[PDB]
Amino acid sequence: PDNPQECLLLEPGLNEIMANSLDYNERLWAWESWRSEVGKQLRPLYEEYVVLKNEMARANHYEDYGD
Amino acid sequence: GWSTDWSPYADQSIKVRISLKSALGDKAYEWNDNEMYLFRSSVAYAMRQYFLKVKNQMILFGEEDVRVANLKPRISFNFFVTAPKNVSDIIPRTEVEKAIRMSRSRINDAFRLNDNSLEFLGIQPT
Amino acid sequence: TIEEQAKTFLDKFNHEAEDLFYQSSLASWNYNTNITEENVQNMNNAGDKWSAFLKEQSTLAQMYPLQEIQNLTVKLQLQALQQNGSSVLSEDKSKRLNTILNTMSTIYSTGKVCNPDNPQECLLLEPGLNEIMANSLDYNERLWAWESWRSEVGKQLRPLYEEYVVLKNEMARANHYEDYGDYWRGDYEVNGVDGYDYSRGQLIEDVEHTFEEIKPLYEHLHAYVRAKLMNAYPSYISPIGCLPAHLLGDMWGRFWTNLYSLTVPFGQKPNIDVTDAMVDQAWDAQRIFKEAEKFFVSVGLPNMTQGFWENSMLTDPGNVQKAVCHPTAWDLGKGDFRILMCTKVTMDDFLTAHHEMGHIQYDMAYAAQPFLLRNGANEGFHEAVGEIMSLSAATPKHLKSIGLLSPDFQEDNETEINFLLKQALTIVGTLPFTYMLEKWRWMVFKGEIPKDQWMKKWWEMKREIVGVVEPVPHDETYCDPASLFHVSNDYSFIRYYTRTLYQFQFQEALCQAAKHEGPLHKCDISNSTEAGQKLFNMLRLGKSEPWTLALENVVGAKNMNVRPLLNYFEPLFTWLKDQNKNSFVGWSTDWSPYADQSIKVRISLKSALGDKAYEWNDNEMYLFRSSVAYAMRQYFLKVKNQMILFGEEDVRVANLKPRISFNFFVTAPKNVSDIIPRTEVEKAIRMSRSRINDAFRLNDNSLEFLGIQPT
Amino acid sequence: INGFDLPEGNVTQENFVDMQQRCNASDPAAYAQLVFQTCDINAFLSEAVEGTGLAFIVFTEAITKMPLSPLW
Ligand SMILES: *[C@@H]1O[C@H](CO)[C@@H](O[C@@H]2O[C@H](CO)[C@@H](O)[C@H](O)[C@H]2NC(C)=O)[C@H](O)[C@H]1NC(C)=O
Ligand SMILES: *[C@@H]1O[C@H](CO)[C@@H](O[C@@H]2O[C@H](CO)[C@@H](O)[C@H](O)[C@H]2NC(C)=O)[C@H](O)[C@H]1NC(C)=O
Ligand SMILES: *[C@@H]1O[C@H](CO)[C@@H](O[C@@H]2O[C@H](CO)[C@@H](O)[C@H](O)[C@H]2NC(C)=O)[C@H](O)[C@H]1NC(C)=O
Ligand SMILES: *[C@@H]1O[C@H](CO)[C@@H](O[C@@H]2O[C@H](CO)[C@@H](O)[C@H](O)[C@H]2NC(C)=O)[C@H](O)[C@H]1NC(C)=O
Ligand SMILES: *[C@@H]1O[C@H](CO)[C@@H](O[C@@H]2O[C@H](CO)[C@@H](O)[C@H](O)[C@H]2NC(C)=O)[C@H](O)[C@H]1NC(C)=O
Ligand SMILES: *[C@@H]1O[C@H](CO)[C@@H](O[C@@H]2O[C@H](CO)[C@@H](O)[C@H](O)[C@H]2NC(C)=O)[C@H](O)[C@H]1NC(C)=O
């Protein structure tokens, strides 16, 4: 937030924070931002994904993709 | 064990009940996501005014900083204001209540409501 | 002593300086020739040692006040060492300023812009944004790049630039200057000379005066480009209005060079390209460089130092060797003149060789001057020298005698109009840009432009001087000027303006000595000692004499005249006038690309409130934008059943006035290009008008939504 | 106020001729488009009413402008 030019990926940066950084604020920042960025982008994708997966499973004679 | 009711943000969360049939009754607007959008925008407005006036700080409060929670068909919910770009920095209920009271009239105007209909639990109208 | 002790000081300083300076220069050259960690520290240490040396001698220079120093030579050198600069600033103040500068630089260099569709693809300015602004012919794509750049990086610079201005002014004021603008106008300032004196304020007057004389030519160029751009971008440009800033062929519109593809006067006619002849005649980098040497010797300029030929990156490392490759002349010192460049078999490289060698010639000429007086008379002298070289070398005449362009060919006036426009796109196109930018900075530094009016006047000046309109209204949260390198990297800009004028003045004067009979645009100063002599007279001077005197040395004048520039483009001018006969020559500073869907909104609090009438502030405006966004959402979700997430940021407000009137238009949630049509917006307002009035305790009468009415 | 876009209340009956003159000075081009009215209560007072207007036009309009207009 302080510097937009510095951007951390999950594996290299966000992981070294959630695994090492013990700062309540820093840990919250990384956690919240991960779900405020990738998670939001995946939201609509996951929704369609679930629909198509369920279709395939039902078409393969299955109760749902979970079944 | 643990309490499924405990939240790290519940302490600064202000419960707000919106009453329409009591006040508006006939021709009462339905509370939708856009109504909720207006509410957070209205709260951000109040927070900006409060800071720029009481603390003389022009803070760019946004509806996104208004973290509303527990939405119910009563049109009840809780909300805690936070810093424009700092989720860690959550505005204290005391300061938020001061902002609320400062613009309570204007917030009522925004929803055509009143202190009785627009119940900011803990914020007592005088 | 006094004068004697000042001299002995300067003499001892000059000797020590040169030898200790050679190291610094050479060290950096070696790193510029080989990128190794060892070579980094090599020049780093040298640099520190060199700078430190100077700093000490600077303090020891004060001991000799010029008030008692009469010999100009000593006086010049002493005053060039007695400068304290940012040393005058408090340690904390200095550090703060330095930090701002680094931050601003970092933002400019590392600032990226992610695609709205895919956030994972984020383009930086250097390659992605520049290639779009130079190549992409998509109104939407260009608008995205331009707007996104200012919105992402420009805001990040706004607060920094503000502090920068304050600290910069303090330093210059403490260095005995009106402002940082005056500090920068000190370059052209001459005192204690009979008729060659020049005031820092004089520069402003001269620049403005000269600019008025170019306006006519630029207006015709603008009108011609406008007409052509109307074809390239239909339903986008008004034939009487300004030019959208995102369509000027680059990020800022500094040059119009990339508009040539859309403005070529005679598409069927090409332009001279002797690169093929070069490769056909096996023109290696050394070959092309010799041709450069030949040209200079032909005009009577000293033969290239054998040393130059010995030590000089005249070709690409070619091997794994990691060497930077920007055409650069090097005055390492102690008679060391080198050129570093990844040269190729290209007409451009051929002309670049002439340009670079031009600088070397200037260096060699003033190399015999006092160490401190070894530079171009002003900041626009050195570059102009290089420019006139490329000019004479580019002439088809030159190429046909260089043995590249079969002289049996006949130069077509259509191809001449072609060439002249292309040059005008680079030369004339930057003149208003450069003028307006420096004007804005000068006014800002002297306080004429207050902080609350920085962006306001920036766009007013753009629309009036440059005739360029913003595609999106930019409030005082933006810093569009700071989005340019020079501004964000603390560099003067008037150099470019002045250089352009000087270049043409020089070229003309030299060609008069060359006894040119044809259009100046096709003049070859090659094989003319007389032109060389005049050139040399100024060349050897260096900083020893006033720039006004050095001008008289070649052009014979003391100030920059634009007549020669106009004379050069006179053929083009006549042509443009013909093309602009039917067209409207000029622009109206009122047409905007967003005015069409803009709704005017007048607010009457006191009319509906009288007493207890709250003051309309930014918060009230924020509320208004939020209310409009709410309306848009409702309208779309109800009439269109479309859940469109409209935010206060999509509500683009403009022309805010104390009558509480303003113009607004709505855009798509993440699409600056996608402007919601006024019809839809009017319907959205109509639908929620009551609600909006309620929010501001107003009524249709007081909340006048011009174009929307009750019934 | 709608033409030279001045603040509401900024211009009053006390400061009108001066304001309009200064506006003409600033923007004569648009001030020319600024249509005005020539009105003085004196004239208003000496504006005769033909027929029965005094009863069914003047007194009736004035009663509506009063509170409890139906009782008057
Ligand atoms: C964002 O907000 C958090 C919470 O207010 C800040 O963390 C505080 O920082 C101060 C100063 O170091 C400490 O005294 C507090 O104890 C911290 N609180 C918590 C909950 O840890 C954080 O510094 C803020 N970040 C920015 C950039 O302002
Ligand atoms: C100012 O100082 C310069 C520097 O020495 C003097 O230039 C010298 O002039 C003499 C006389 O012609 C020459 O013999 C020297 O070789 C010159 N030296 C250099 C390096 O220029 C100049 O003459 C001095 N001016 C005055 C007023 O005496
Ligand atoms: C740079 O610093 C020097 C040193 O303070 C300034 O020169 C001084 O000026 C004051 C005021 O007249 C005198 O009292 C000192 O004796 C001067 N010192 C010396 C030895 O020069 C100089 O004016 C400053 N100039 C800039 C560029 O700010
Ligand atoms: C200056 O004169 C030289 C000498 O004639 C020119 O160089 C000649 O150019 C022609 C045309 O290509 C060749 O046929 C000759 O063989 C060249 N001679 C030499 C000595 O190189 C040179 O081009 C002239 N420069 C200009 C353009 O004025
Ligand atoms: C170059 O010169 C020729 C010679 O005049 C120009 O050709 C003329 O073009 C105009 C306009 O098209 C005609 O009205 C004339 O009748 C043409 N004359 C001849 C003899 O061709 C040509 O236009 C010139 N090129 C440019 C770019 O102006
Ligand atoms: C963003 O908005 C612009 C302007 O509405 C869009 O550009 C036009 O989009 C329509 C719809 O696809 C096309 O029919 C037009 O041809 C486009 N204009 C041009 C100049 O090609 C743009 O497609 C929108 N993009 C996004 C990201 O939604």
PDB file of C-alpha atoms in Angstrom, chain C residues 132-243:
ATOM      1  CA  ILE C 132       1.070   1.725 -27.950  1.00  0.00           C
ATOM      2  CA  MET C 133       1.376   5.558 -28.005  1.00  0.00           C
ATOM      3  CA  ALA C 134       3.805   5.315 -31.018  1.00  0.00           C
ATOM      4  CA  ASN C 135       2.109   2.486 -33.047  1.00  0.00           C
ATOM      5  CA  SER C 136      -1.418   1.572 -31.745  1.00  0.00           C
ATOM      6  CA  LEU C 137      -3.990   3.472 -33.887  1.00  0.00           C
ATOM      7  CA  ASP C 138      -6.957   2.413 -31.645  1.00  0.00           C
ATOM      8  CA  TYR C 139      -8.685   5.479 -30.052  1.00  0.00           C
ATOM      9  CA  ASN C 140      -9.752   3.227 -27.094  1.00  0.00           C
ATOM     10  CA  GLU C 141      -6.289   1.617 -26.610  1.00  0.00           C
ATOM     11  CA  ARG C 142      -4.427   4.980 -26.906  1.00  0.00           C
ATOM     12  CA  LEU C 143      -6.934   6.661 -24.532  1.00  0.00           C
ATOM     13  CA  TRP C 144      -6.425   3.789 -22.056  1.00  0.00           C
ATOM     14  CA  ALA C 145      -2.558   4.075 -22.146  1.00  0.00           C
ATOM     15  CA  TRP C 146      -2.561   7.935 -21.809  1.00  0.00           C
ATOM     16  CA  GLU C 147      -5.255   8.145 -19.118  1.00  0.00           C
ATOM     17  CA  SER C 148      -3.923   5.070 -17.192  1.00  0.00           C
ATOM     18  CA  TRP C 149      -0.351   6.488 -17.150  1.00  0.00           C
ATOM     19  CA  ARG C 150      -1.459   9.846 -15.594  1.00  0.00           C
ATOM     20  CA  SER C 151      -3.981   8.098 -13.240  1.00  0.00           C
ATOM     21  CA  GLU C 152      -1.408   5.550 -11.865  1.00  0.00           C
ATOM     22  CA  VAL C 153       1.990   7.346 -11.908  1.00  0.00           C
ATOM     23  CA  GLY C 154       0.837  10.976 -12.216  1.00  0.00           C
ATOM     24  CA  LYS C 155      -1.006  10.892  -8.842  1.00  0.00           C
ATOM     25  CA  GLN C 156       2.047   9.230  -7.173  1.00  0.00           C
ATOM     26  CA  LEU C 157       4.142  12.285  -8.270  1.00  0.00           C
ATOM     27  CA  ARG C 158       1.605  15.046  -7.270  1.00  0.00           C
ATOM     28  CA  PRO C 159       2.549  15.286  -3.511  1.00  0.00           C
ATOM     29  CA  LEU C 160       6.301  14.723  -4.223  1.00  0.00           C
ATOM     30  CA  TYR C 161       6.342  17.438  -6.950  1.00  0.00           C
ATOM     31  CA  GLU C 162       4.669  19.893  -4.481  1.00  0.00           C
ATOM     32  CA  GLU C 163       7.387  19.356  -1.790  1.00  0.00           C
ATOM     33  CA  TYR C 164      10.079  19.364  -4.567  1.00  0.00           C
ATOM     34  CA  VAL C 165       8.870  22.852  -5.701  1.00  0.00           C
ATOM     35  CA  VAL C 166       9.044  24.235  -2.099  1.00  0.00           C
ATOM     36  CA  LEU C 167      12.563  22.863  -1.341  1.00  0.00           C
ATOM     37  CA  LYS C 168      13.856  23.839  -4.845  1.00  0.00           C
ATOM     38  CA  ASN C 169      12.630  27.458  -4.384  1.00  0.00           C
ATOM     39  CA  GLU C 170      14.197  27.699  -0.870  1.00  0.00           C
ATOM     40  CA  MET C 171      17.584  26.468  -2.197  1.00  0.00           C
ATOM     41  CA  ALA C 172      17.596  28.942  -5.148  1.00  0.00           C
ATOM     42  CA  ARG C 173      16.341  31.831  -2.906  1.00  0.00           C
ATOM     43  CA  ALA C 174      19.218  31.006  -0.499  1.00  0.00           C
ATOM     44  CA  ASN C 175      21.496  30.901  -3.631  1.00  0.00           C
ATOM     45  CA  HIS C 176      20.320  34.560  -4.285  1.00  0.00           C
ATOM     46  CA  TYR C 177      17.539  33.856  -6.875  1.00  0.00           C
ATOM     47  CA  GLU C 178      13.866  34.952  -7.174  1.00  0.00           C
ATOM     48  CA  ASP C 179      12.784  31.255  -7.620  1.00  0.00           C
ATOM     49  CA  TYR C 180      13.968  27.884  -9.039  1.00  0.00           C
ATOM     50  CA  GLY C 181      12.784  29.218 -12.462  1.00  0.00           C
ATOM     51  CA  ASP C 182      15.171  32.193 -12.131  1.00  0.00           C
ATOM     52  CA  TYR C 183      17.863  29.706 -10.932  1.00  0.00           C
ATOM     53  CA  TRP C 184      17.365  27.842 -14.291  1.00  0.00           C
ATOM     54  CA  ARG C 185      17.290  31.115 -16.366  1.00  0.00           C
ATOM     55  CA  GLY C 186      20.825  31.932 -14.992  1.00  0.00           C
ATOM     56  CA  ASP C 187      22.376  29.806 -17.807  1.00  0.00           C
ATOM     57  CA  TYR C 188      21.634  32.472 -20.500  1.00  0.00           C
ATOM     58  CA  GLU C 189      22.532  35.389 -18.095  1.00  0.00           C
ATOM     59  CA  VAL C 190      25.510  37.611 -19.149  1.00  0.00           C
ATOM     60  CA  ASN C 191      26.897  40.583 -17.086  1.00  0.00           C
ATOM     61  CA  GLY C 192      29.921  42.984 -17.196  1.00  0.00           C
ATOM     62  CA  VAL C 193      30.191  42.836 -21.056  1.00  0.00           C
ATOM     63  CA  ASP C 194      29.718  45.836 -23.460  1.00  0.00           C
ATOM     64  CA  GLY C 195      26.448  45.181 -25.423  1.00  0.00           C
ATOM     65  CA  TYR C 196      26.733  41.340 -24.854  1.00  0.00           C
ATOM     66  CA  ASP C 197      24.932  41.451 -21.432  1.00  0.00           C
ATOM     67  CA  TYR C 198      21.702  39.397 -21.097  1.00  0.00           C
ATOM     68  CA  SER C 199      19.188  39.317 -18.170  1.00  0.00           C
ATOM     69  CA  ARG C 200      17.596  36.074 -16.832  1.00  0.00           C
ATOM     70  CA  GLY C 201      14.162  37.773 -17.295  1.00  0.00           C
ATOM     71  CA  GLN C 202      15.168  38.753 -20.887  1.00  0.00           C
ATOM     72  CA  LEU C 203      15.067  34.999 -21.791  1.00  0.00           C
ATOM     73  CA  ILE C 204      11.286  34.881 -20.988  1.00  0.00           C
ATOM     74  CA  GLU C 205      10.550  37.978 -23.168  1.00  0.00           C
ATOM     75  CA  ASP C 206      12.754  36.660 -26.053  1.00  0.00           C
ATOM     76  CA  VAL C 207      11.205  33.129 -25.940  1.00  0.00           C
ATOM     77  CA  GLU C 208       7.631  34.581 -25.914  1.00  0.00           C
ATOM     78  CA  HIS C 209       8.467  37.160 -28.687  1.00  0.00           C
ATOM     79  CA  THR C 210      10.034  34.487 -30.963  1.00  0.00           C
ATOM     80  CA  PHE C 211       7.129  32.083 -30.215  1.00  0.00           C
ATOM     81  CA  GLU C 212       4.569  34.662 -31.518  1.00  0.00           C
ATOM     82  CA  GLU C 213       6.427  34.733 -34.892  1.00  0.00           C
ATOM     83  CA  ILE C 214       6.207  30.864 -35.252  1.00  0.00           C
ATOM     84  CA  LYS C 215       2.471  30.670 -34.213  1.00  0.00           C
ATOM     85  CA  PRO C 216       1.195  31.206 -37.850  1.00  0.00           C
ATOM     86  CA  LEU C 217       3.302  28.311 -39.303  1.00  0.00           C
ATOM     87  CA  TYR C 218       2.352  25.993 -36.366  1.00  0.00           C
ATOM     88  CA  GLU C 219      -1.392  26.892 -36.818  1.00  0.00           C
ATOM     89  CA  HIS C 220      -1.225  25.710 -40.476  1.00  0.00           C
ATOM     90  CA  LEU C 221       0.680  22.529 -39.398  1.00  0.00           C
ATOM     91  CA  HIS C 222      -1.956  21.960 -36.654  1.00  0.00           C
ATOM     92  CA  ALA C 223      -4.885  22.489 -39.131  1.00  0.00           C
ATOM     93  CA  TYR C 224      -3.274  20.111 -41.709  1.00  0.00           C
ATOM     94  CA  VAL C 225      -2.618  17.405 -39.023  1.00  0.00           C
ATOM     95  CA  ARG C 226      -6.174  17.921 -37.637  1.00  0.00           C
ATOM     96  CA  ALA C 227      -7.699  17.300 -41.106  1.00  0.00           C
ATOM     97  CA  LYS C 228      -5.634  14.092 -41.590  1.00  0.00           C
ATOM     98  CA  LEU C 229      -6.315  12.879 -38.004  1.00  0.00           C
ATOM     99  CA  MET C 230     -10.081  13.401 -38.670  1.00  0.00           C
ATOM    100  CA  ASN C 231      -9.773  10.674 -41.394  1.00  0.00           C
ATOM    101  CA  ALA C 232      -7.653   8.353 -39.140  1.00  0.00           C
ATOM    102  CA  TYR C 233     -10.089   8.950 -36.172  1.00  0.00           C
ATOM    103  CA  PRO C 234     -13.605   9.721 -37.589  1.00  0.00           C
ATOM    104  CA  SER C 235     -16.311  11.077 -35.176  1.00  0.00           C
ATOM    105  CA  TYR C 236     -13.425  11.903 -32.736  1.00  0.00           C
ATOM    106  CA  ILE C 237     -11.939  15.273 -33.868  1.00  0.00           C
ATOM    107  CA  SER C 238     -13.750  18.596 -34.391  1.00  0.00           C
ATOM    108  CA  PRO C 239     -12.452  20.388 -37.560  1.00  0.00           C
ATOM    109  CA  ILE C 240     -12.505  23.696 -35.548  1.00  0.00           C
ATOM    110  CA  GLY C 241     -11.473  22.289 -32.116  1.00  0.00           C
ATOM    111  CA  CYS C 242      -8.174  21.293 -30.410  1.00  0.00           C
ATOM    112  CA  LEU C 243      -6.472  17.864 -30.921  1.00  0.00           C
TER     113      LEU C 243
END
